[PDB]
Amino acid sequence: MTELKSKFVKVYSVLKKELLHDSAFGLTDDSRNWVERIMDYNVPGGKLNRGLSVVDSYKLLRELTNSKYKSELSDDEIFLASVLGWSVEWIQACALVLDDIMCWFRLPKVGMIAINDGLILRNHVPRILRTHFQTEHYYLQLVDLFHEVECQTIAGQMLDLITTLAGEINLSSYSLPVYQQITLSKTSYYSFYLPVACALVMLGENLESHDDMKDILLEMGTYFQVQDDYLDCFGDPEVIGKIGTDIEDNKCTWLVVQALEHCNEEQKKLLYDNYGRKDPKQVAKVKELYKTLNLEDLFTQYENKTCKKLTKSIEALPNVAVQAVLKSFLAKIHKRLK
Amino acid sequence: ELKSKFVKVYSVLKKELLHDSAFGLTDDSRNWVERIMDYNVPGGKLNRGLSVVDSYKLLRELTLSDDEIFLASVLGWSVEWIQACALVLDDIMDHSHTRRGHPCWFRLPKVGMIAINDGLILRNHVPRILRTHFQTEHYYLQLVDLFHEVECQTIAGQMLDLITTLAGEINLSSYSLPVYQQITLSKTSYYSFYLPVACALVMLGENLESHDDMKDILLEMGTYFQVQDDYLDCFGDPEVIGKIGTDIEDNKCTWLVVQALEHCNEEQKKLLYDNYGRKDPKQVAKVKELYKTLNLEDLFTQYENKTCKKLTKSIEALPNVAVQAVLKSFLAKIHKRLK
């Protein structure tokens, strides 16, 4: 089960050798190994669905719009899309650098190591894009698109940092607006906007002519994160392949915030005294408070209403290839159990 | 005088950014963006941005169009935008206090989100400024590289500083010298000292990859500049500085606090835990008195004399006499300064 995905995976190794044995940025033999270890720990491995969606999207935009000379994707076409797909995976790798880190005094030294790891990787994307796109017309537009998503990611990463730290001293810091900003800037941009926007820039398109699609993808990114959060609570761990830890891990879950908005005083103090522990006695009291607040129903309500909104906004787009791409994104997420 | 010729450049750029066809904005959003813009970028001495133009002027002399000054000033004002973004988060602990100056925490992420999003707005101006005014030059890509380097180095430092300032409220042992050095270097040294000279240099038609030694000097000189800052906030003629030192009350990660924790023993360590990040002058004085007892006034004289001599030596070892002149100018205006 790999096909063009196997053809995609190889590109990481090509970019990695380029980045390491680059004359413009020399490296000690010890520097190279140190950088390569950071690269391999952080960037390859995983589902790769974000980077691949760049290639899958570029393939669907070409298949439908065309007006190019042939509809089959060139080997050089597949490769360049994969280079952007892997740039996406680098952006992603940087965004997650901090997600462990979690007593307190050991935290800034620990955090310092992680920050420098991402510093190394962040300085890779400009070089990747320059090596492989410096000559195209759209190069400057591509640098913009990446600068925007890169900068929005860093903002979301900083808020998630402030927020996950402030959550250890007071759960009331987790709020609905803050959750939406973290989800939007830290995740939605690279996850849903960035792939397709990459396919469009190399397809020879201007992004300022797709603001209606950019709002759709960003909202679809929020919807996707509300899904993950919900699944981490209850969703057949044998289907997901993972045990839910968000309630234990003291995460800023869509569930937790919707809880503290609807539940009051007595229910609120129940949550402070039971959220984020490791024995199931408190984990179940939480899961029961969510059931008491009907949060499975509030979620399923949110799901159908948001799906209707986006399908409407999608059916209302002028670009049939774009909407065909967004329709595949939305149906691949809808009511997914995994 | 040339300062007045430099300041209007801000208004030039501010007018460009707002009434950009490529970036439409409501009249009501434009006021909001302008309020963010001028609250954060102009005002203050503007010395970093000015050092770009003075540096270009000294480099050119030792090897002048009005438009030249404009472009140099455009880069100097670019520096001020970077400086602005680095500092957006610095009073995040005192603006979350919607009380007096008491613990908060729940109101902290809302406060931070505002700040983060302000700096996000200002961070998107530098690429537009550099493109508008340099898209066409030989060195344009060298400029985009240079600003991406410092921009990213700045971003790392504030992220570490954030982690550090938060973890410093709970458990004081979080403040350490390696963490202090990293923050000082990545958050500050890059934009303040490297970036100005590097701007004057790349526009002067130079490649930065052949100035690694000058860069190492400038970054270290930036760290030296911050250790001076920290030391003065404790004892440095509060009447001369024109400001009252607030660092001990504010529970800041000072070079001094770090050096104290290194030298002091468990009794002195507890004196520091039980005082320090408090308000009353009685507890603040126990610290400033503990600093004296640990000999941190002389330890500072050692760092300064050694860093000054060490850098003077490294600078004189540069082949480029024009570069040596600029770094010597920076070093001698920082040296033993009382304000």
Author numbering:
A (entry chain B): 1 to 102, 113 to 348
B (entry chain A): 3 to 65, 73 to 348
Quoted from the paper:
The crystal structure of apo EuTPT3 was determined from two crystal forms with space groups P43212 and C2, refined at 3.0 and 3.3 Å resolution, respectively. The superimposition parameters suggested that the dimeric architecture of EuTPS3 was highly conserved and unlikely to be caused by crystal packing. In EuTPT3, α6 of one subunit interacted with α5 and α6 of the neighboring subunit to form a four-helix bundle, whereas, in EuFPS1, α4 of one subunit was inserted between α5 and α6 of the neighboring subunit to form a six-helix bundle of α4–α6 at the dimer interface. Thus, EuTPT3 had a larger central tunnel than EuFPS1. The tunnel is mainly composed by hydrophobic residues of α5 and α6, which is considered the path for the products because the chain length determination element locates in this region. Among the structural elements involved in substrate binding and catalytic activity, EuTPT3 featured two conserved DDxxD motifs at the active site, both of which could contribute to substrate recognition. EuTPT3 also featured structurally conserved basic residues (Lys46, Arg50, Arg109, and Lys348) in the equivalent positions. Crystal structure of EuTPT3 showed that the residues Ile164-Ala165 contact with Ile164 and Ile125 of the neighboring subunit in the hydrophobic tunnel, suggesting that smaller side chains such as valine and glycine provide the wider path for the product that may contribute to the activity difference.
Prenyltransferases, also known as isoprenyl diphosphate synthases, catalyze the sequential condensation of a basic five-carbon building block (C5), the isopentenyl diphosphate (IPP), to synthesize prenyl precursors of isoprenoid metabolites and isoprene polymers, collectively called polyisoprene. Ultrahigh molecular weight cis-1,4-polyisoprene and trans-1,4-polyisoprene (TPI), which are the principal components of natural rubber and gutta-percha, respectively, are also isoprenoid metabolites that are assumed to be synthesized by specialized prenyltransferases. These prenyltransferases are divided into two major groups, the cis-1,4-prenyltransferases (CPTs) and trans-1,4-prenyltransferases (TPTs), based on the stereochemistry of the double bond formed during IPP condensation. To investigate the molecular properties of the EuTPT proteins, we determined the three-dimensional structures of EuTPT3 and EuFPS1 using X-ray crystallography. Similar to EuFPS1 and other prenyltransferases, the EuTPT3 subunits were composed of 10 core helices (α1-α10) with a deep pocket that included two DDxxD motifs responsible for substrates binding.
